[PDB]
Design a protein around this ligand. Structure first.
Ligand SMILES: NC(=O)C1=CN([C@@H]2O[C@H](COP(=O)(O)OP(=O)(O)OC[C@H]3O[C@@H](n4cnc5c(N)ncnc54)[C@H](OP(=O)(O)O)[C@@H]3O)[C@@H](O)[C@H]2O)C=CC1
Ligand SMILES: NC(=O)C1=CN([C@@H]2O[C@H](COP(=O)(O)OP(=O)(O)OC[C@H]3O[C@@H](n4cnc5c(N)ncnc54)[C@H](OP(=O)(O)O)[C@@H]3O)[C@@H](O)[C@H]2O)C=CC1
Lengths: 348, 348
């Protein structure tokens, strides 16, 4: 009946934001029989390496967090987003089946839903219109991962569950400036703005990768940071939903212990058995940036540059299905950002 | 203008219905430099074997015809349809790019289009609604195939074209009942029912490769074959489009010679760069069956078994795009069935 304290657990991609929170929350709950492989010891795109790993380690449970993620900086990698994510998904999912994995959890993305779908997004809005253009191939790969899980559950009686989320953040998130995840990057930008407005050359230099402070200030300004203001592109009315990675780990563990494919099936032709996860509430980028600015204590202005349009669709999950299955989020956004900022300050 | 007589051409899946016609057409047209590998010498799902083949063979052009087809007999293989076809597509397309293949042609399916799309199906109907339940995971795989070709073309400037077709038949078809498509299967059914009505036990045993007539008669009845009737599972009302594999080979070769990715993009609106191929004409399964019945000369009647959840989905391509690009079909259905039947009695 679900995971046991001695169950062998593989968290794929365990160094990422979701993966780190899954490791720490599993062991806080008493599950420490973990199998972990960094990218350098196991390239999940390589089918031979993945098949060898599953044959040797025989994990009983799998949390598949590894991804090549679509972001504003790397959007040109249209081919890589579909190839690499399809290969990770196929390799891990099929080899879990071959080696009699008990349950698996795969994480979907809100980019799998049509660009013009109604918010809040229901699980049955899959395939109801075209995907957003920049995330088109990434979203198609996420669709194929969700359909793969379901197709293995139907043909082979596996228990492979897809949980779909929008924006992740966490106590120990990826604040690196290249793969610019929305909430961690906003937090760091207001933190650097506060350090700049205080005249703190050293901690800026340490917090950045850099040794030339004039180069640092130019780098700050490219991201809208100034002594007396933070400027962000757009109207500020684009709306986003966020989930703290402790809540991500909480629902993923709850799914392992409680939600089986039979719990999701329709009366006949069962489809759309993926489950949305999230907090069910969204905020405008203006409301989020202001919450970060207050938590950080930056004294300067918040400015929205409406000359270059934000373009983006709103994304908010309808979480009524996971609620009915017995799980709801524990961390509200203001409390979650405060957790993230306290860890961030005690870091470098 | 592209492939030359001495260009090295790889036809993946060369022993199949599409692949056999492509091979004979290429050879008879003077292309003397073909690489062919059976499934036993090259498993296209195995990434390691495929990467070795391209690295060590360096084909210049690729026709990707290998597939796990979705038919009425194997509809239960819902997981194999998406995993196996995704792996074949991923391995061949990516290792083509990795080894500087000049051009590739991939075959999509009309199951990639929404079940309730209007007919004739336009290329832009991709993602405008859900897929039919039986072909769902197969159609999702074929969607990802078409999107990967386009994505590699966009990011890397490859020249990977997707041609999308509905029902395939051909002169040297697979008649083997475990995998045979609906037109070759109907052909063998009426032929067998004709032999049964004529009473020649010996020829039935030879066609079925059986040495017990009581087992033979049980096998025929279970496939709906009798002295006085052939039954078909369905209403017989659904309308489908068929293309003969010689026409498929012709348009695949015509595409390789004439149609480039740069021809397919309307500037910034580069999406739906797949191309429908077909004959532009529909037939109900009832119309097809008694056309087959009259060509084999069976004296009996059709019988329809209604079944709990029949397809109800028509499939007919809109071919305006390929027609404007300079190709039209040549082989009408009645002529193609007669070609197939003449080859059939050559084997039996
Ligand atoms: N974060 C978000 O805002 C969203 C997250 N999700 C989903 O949540 C899941 C995890 O997200 P997140 O935690 O943000 O992902 P991260 O990008 O933070 O971490 C991903 C992990 O995958 C590893 N990885 C990538 N490619 C390979 C590979 N070929 N072989 C081995 N390891 C590899 C990376 O390793 P390295 O660090 O060495 O590259 C990294 O540790 C993903 O499925 C993602 O799509 C869904 C929607 C949005
Ligand atoms: N038939 C129809 O009505 C429809 C057809 N299509 C299109 O038809 C195209 C192909 O037509 P067709 O040629 O008739 O399909 P077939 O199944 O007739 O041919 C498939 C070929 O690929 C080979 N193959 C399959 N898997 C592997 C593998 N893992 N390694 C090596 N070889 C493999 C098979 O070999 P083996 O014999 O060893 O399996 C066979 O020779 C597909 O791309 C599909 O899109 C689309 C929609 C409907």
């Amino acid at each position: 009946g679900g995971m046991q304290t001695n169950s062998k657990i593989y968290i794929a991609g365990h160094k990422g934001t979701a993966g780190t929170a899954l490791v720490e929350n599993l062991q806080k709950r008493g599950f420490n029989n973990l199998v972990l492989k960094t990218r350098q010891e196991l390239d999940l795109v390589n089918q031979q390496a993945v098949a060898k790993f599953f044959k040797e380690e025989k994990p009983e449970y799998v949390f598949l967090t590894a991804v090549l993620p679509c972001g504003a900086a790397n959007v040109a990698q249209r081919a890589d987003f579909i190839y690499e994510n399809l290969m990770i998904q196929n390799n891990v999912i099929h080899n879990s089946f071959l080696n009699n994995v008990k349950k698996l959890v795969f994480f979907g993305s809100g980019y799998m839903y049509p660009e013009n779908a109604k918010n809040p997004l229901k699980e049955e809005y899959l395939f109801q219109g075209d995907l957003e253009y920049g995330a088109y191939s990434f979203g198609a790969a996420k669709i194929a991962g969700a359909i793969m899980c379901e197709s293995y559950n139907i043909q082979y009686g596996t228990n492979f569950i897809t949980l779909v989320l929008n924006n992740l953040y966490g106590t120990k998130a990826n604040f690196d400036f290249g793969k610019s995840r929305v909430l961690p990057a906003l937090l760091r930008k207001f933190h650097l703005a506060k350090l700049l407005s205080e005249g703190n050359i050293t901690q800026i230099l340490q917090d950045l990768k850099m040794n030339n402070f004039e180069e640092a200030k130019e780098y700050l300004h490219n991201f809208g940071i100034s002594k007396k203001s933070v400027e962000i592109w757009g109207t500020g009315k684009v709306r986003r939903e966020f989930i703290h990675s402790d809540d991500l780990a909480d629902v993923a563990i709850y799914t392992m212990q409680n939600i089986d494919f039979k719990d999701l099936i329709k009366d006949r032709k069962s489809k759309n058995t993926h489950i949305n996860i999230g907090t069910g509430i969204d905020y405008s980028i203006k409301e989020v940036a202001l919450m970060v600015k207050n938590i950080v204590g930056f004294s300067g202005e918040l400015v929205f540059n409406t000359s270059r349009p934000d373009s983006t669709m709103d994304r908010l999950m309808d979480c009524s299905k996971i609620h009915s299955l017995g799980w709801k989020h524990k961390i509200e956004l203001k409390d979650g950002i405060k957790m993230m900022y306290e860890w961030y300050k005690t870091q470098n």
